[PDB]
Amino acid sequence: MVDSSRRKWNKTGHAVRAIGRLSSLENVYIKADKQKNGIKANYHIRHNIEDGGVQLAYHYQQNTPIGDGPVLLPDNHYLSVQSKLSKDPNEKRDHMVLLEFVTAAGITLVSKGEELFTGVVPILVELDGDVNGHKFSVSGEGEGDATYGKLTLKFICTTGKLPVPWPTLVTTLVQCFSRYPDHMKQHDFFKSAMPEGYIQERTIFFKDDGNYKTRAEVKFEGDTLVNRIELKGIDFKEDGNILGHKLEYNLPDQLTEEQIAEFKEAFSLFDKDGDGTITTKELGTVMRSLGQNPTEAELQDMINEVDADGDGTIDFPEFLTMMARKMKYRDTEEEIREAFGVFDKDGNGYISAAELRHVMTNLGEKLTDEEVDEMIREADIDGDGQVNYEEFVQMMT
Ligand SMILES: [Ca+2]
Ligand SMILES: [Ca+2]
Ligand SMILES: [Ca+2]
Ligand SMILES: [Ca+2]
Ligand code: NA
């Protein structure tokens, strides 16, 4: 009864959420910058806020070769990055342990500098920072293995306490370790600039707060890949998320079997032929039943956003990965309102039973005019017989 309702809901909410993810740009987007003989990159990072929503950090980036040698200017593509932050239980100093996995994708189905990345390469990181006049240094060390896009670093704040959250420095503190697939080796700018290296420059805008400006030199010093950085931060709020340390350090590396099974149920609403992959046709069917009407091109681009193997379809594991990440890094209010907007057909700020029934039956759920009410009940905080925004928020967690 309650069970069925709760279950029928998760499936819908998850499907809507999947469309939200597929309509978003969460990767690192790289483009050639012929005028500078380099590349540009653009992306955003989500920083979960302790007991709250999410902090956005909008990154603009340029990389320029230090040397005169030829480099590879890529076609447009992306890097997909997975990071984990941890603490060294024996470390007394303010520190961060970082693991990253970085892979290039985005282009559907080898430079001299790449030979320097065939095995495990030692890394040294040095940063000097100044944020609102609060100065600091970080040293880090570790190793990278481009064969797997793997890197592991440990950083120490050598000046005492870091005056900003460690997660805000992850992107600043070696994309040369990215795994490029065989068909995309001609688009690896980073390794092509080695050993002489490149300059990596960023402006990072933390929404509703200040911005970082960074300049780094990434180059070999003997056998070690070194990342030397300068960071300047201005316009930060003294009691904002950054200077006020209001950001979460790490997420459970967890995700229960029950959450995974919920993802699988949602997957199966898109994979209508049961073949274990989602096609543009399947994707378009679901979107249209939700009242959208994307073109073929939009459908291919939505799939391409999460298509790890470049086959043109969202395979079962690609979808699982995408959902896991959508649940770990929180949504903006604008994104939750878009999702709400799918159900709220008249746009009055209230999901009626008639609206919900419309959405469900459109998605091809066989539900009773009683199961429909049963669903509203579960979500209805204030007992008005409808679902408002704050109530939707709850229904989506
Ligand atoms: Ca299928
Ligand atoms: Ca695929
Ligand atoms: Ca409405
Ligand atoms: Ca209500
Ligand atoms: Na603001």
Numbering used by the authors: 47 to 155, 170 to 233, 237 to 460
What does the report in the manuscript say about this coordinate set?
At the first stage of this study, we replaced circularly permuted EGFP (cpEGFP)—the fluorescent core of GCaMP6s—with circularly permuted BrUSLEE. Since the permutation procedure in the original GCaMP6s involves the deletion of a 4-amino-acid fragment (corresponding to positions 145–148 in the parental protein), and, thus, the removal of the 145th amino acid residue, which is an important structural determinant of the fluorescent properties of BrUSLEE, we engineered two variants of the construct, with (GCaMP6s-BrUS) and without (GCaMP6s-BrUS-145) the M145 residue. Four calcium ions are tightly bound in CaM domains at the corresponding binding sites, confirming the holo-form of the indicator.
In contrast, the GCaMP6s-BrUS-145 variant exhibited a pronounced calcium-dependent change in its mean lifetime over a wide range. In contrast, the GCaMP6s-BrUS-145 variant was found to be extremely dim, showing only 10.5% of GCaMP6s’ brightness. The mean lifetime of GCaMP6s-BrUS-145 exhibited a well-defined dependence on calcium concentration: as the calcium concentration increases from 17 to 350 nM (1–7 mM [CaEGTA]), it decreases from approximately 2.4 ns to 0.8 ns. The most remarkable differences were observed in the following regions: the mobile linker 314(-/M)LPDQL319, together with the part of the first α-helix of the CaM domain, where the distance between the correspondent Cα atoms reaches 4.4 Å and the last Ca-binding site at residues 428–443 (2.4 Å)—other minor discrepancy was found in the 320–324 region. It is noteworthy that the shortening of the 314–319 linker led to a significant and simultaneous shift of this linker as well as the C-lobe of the CaM domain and M13 helix compared to the GCaMP6s-BrUS structure, reflecting the increased rigidity of the shortened linker. Compared to GCaMP6s-BrUS, the resolution of GCaMP6s-BrUS-145 is higher, allowing the visualization of extra two solvent molecules in the vicinity of the chromophore. These molecules mediate the hydrogen bonding of the OH-atom of the tyrosine moiety of the chromophore with the side-chain of S129 as well as the main chain oxygens of E72 and H90 and the main chain nitrogen of V127. In contrast, in the GCaMP6s-BrUS-145 structure, the guanidine group of the corresponding R388 is turned to the opposite side in the direction of the mobile linker 315LPDQL319 and forms the solvent-mediated hydrogen bond with the side chain oxygen of Y392 and the main chain nitrogen of S129. Such changes in the conformation of R389 (R388) may influence the solvent accessibility of the chromophore, potentially controlling the degree of solvent-based fluorescence quenching. For example, GCaMP6s-BrUS-145 has the largest fluorescence lifetime contrast between the so-called Apo and Sat forms of the indicator described so far (both in relative and absolute terms).
